[PDB]
Design a binder for this molecule. Sequence first.
Ligand code: BNG
Ligand code: BNG
Ligand code: BNG
Ligand code: 2VY
Length: 177
Amino acid sequence: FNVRLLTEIAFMAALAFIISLIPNTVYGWIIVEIACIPILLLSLRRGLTAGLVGGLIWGILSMITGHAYILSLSQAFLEYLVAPVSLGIAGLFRQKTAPLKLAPVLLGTFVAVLLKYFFHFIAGIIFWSQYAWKGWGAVAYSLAVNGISGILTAIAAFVILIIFVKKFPKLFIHSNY
Ligand SMILES: CCCCCCCCCO[C@@H]1O[C@H](CO)[C@@H](O)[C@H](O)[C@H]1O
Ligand SMILES: CCCCCCCCCO[C@@H]1O[C@H](CO)[C@@H](O)[C@H](O)[C@H]1O
Ligand SMILES: CCCCCCCCCO[C@@H]1O[C@H](CO)[C@@H](O)[C@H](O)[C@H]1O
Ligand SMILES: Cc1ncc(Cc2csc(C=O)c2C)c(N)n1
């Protein structure tokens, strides 16, 4: 049903935003983005389009609540529309049939967090270089900050989605009935 789908999309976007309110800073803009997780789960369970749309709504929530860090129109577009929308790419690893296998869950999480932090890394180069550490070029700087955020976000998403695969595998498989 379309009703069920819209609500799940809506709820997971809201959940992501709500989770984004937890302090998640390790050092500067090195962060653990646990708020990616409801979007990943949404995409993994409902597929690409649902995932893309959940990401969109999450990004729009960040911006209109003042919880987004904005430097320009293009940068906000890149980092709060494209980047969260890109998480939906996880939907390409949706499993429709039991038994749930772990490897597609990890593979789709890895690819989507990577795709997300790839866009932040491009952002870092164009929009954030003024903050590059003493002696660091912009590309190197952005790689470390966003390469490390990506890895820690993926670590976090794995821990949680692994627990879910083992204790609640059906979260990942949509049933009409
Ligand atoms: C697709 C829906 C997304 C639109 C939501 C954008 C949220 C508004 C944030 O913009 C803000 O505008 C203010 C006025 O110029 C500036 O004071 C501030 O610096 C800038 O951050
Ligand atoms: C595609 C996402 C929609 C984004 C809408 C919010 C745009 C917020 C604009 O912020 C402002 O941008 C100016 C240049 O763009 C800067 O000069 C200014 O310092 C900065 O505060
Ligand atoms: C997924 C990535 C996570 C690890 C972060 C890697 C840090 C990037 C370092 O880059 C290199 O540092 C050299 C230091 O000598 C510079 O000279 C060189 O120009 C630059 O390219
Ligand atoms: C060096 C660097 N610093 C800050 C950001 C901005 C950023 C990093 S993760 C994330 C998720 O909301 C945002 C807005 C960046 N891209 N690169």
